[PDB]
Design a protein around this ligand. Sequence first.
Ligand SMILES: [Zn+2]
Ligand SMILES: [Zn+2]
Ligand SMILES: [Zn+2]
Ligand SMILES: [Zn+2]
Length: 118
Amino acid sequence: HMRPFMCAYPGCNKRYFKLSHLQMHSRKHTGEKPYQCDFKDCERRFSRSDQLKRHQRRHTGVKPFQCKTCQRKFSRSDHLKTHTRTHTGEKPFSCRWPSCQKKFARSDELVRHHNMHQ
DNA sequence: GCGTGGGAGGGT
DNA sequence: ACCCTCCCACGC
Ligand SMILES: [Zn+2]
Ligand SMILES: [Zn+2]
Ligand SMILES: [Zn+2]
Ligand SMILES: [Zn+2]
């Protein structure tokens, strides 16, 4: 088996291919958030090292993902993904309320719009 | 509308 | 430990 380091916590069946990966994962089961941001006057702490690294981009200003259309840079790949739909004009999320015919590019836009109807 | 955070869960 | 993708939230 390629992932032999198995979590033994109640309710969890996660498994990893390095012991250190299992060790970092298991700390969430006791509520640990050992990855604290060391920027001045920032009390943010995270259970995962990649969560802290993503967070600190708001301090450093590093944006490693660039739009091939307008050359704007973004700190997160998923935010670049939804951004590119502003150029394609794709609106995959349609409101189904009668005589509305509204369409939206992001899923949470439809959620907020659905709550407007009620 | 859409930038851009947090939380989460899958993979490696 | 890093990476990608999704929902959810808040702000203007
Ligand atoms: Zn576990
Ligand atoms: Zn911080
Ligand atoms: Zn763009
Ligand atoms: Zn509608």
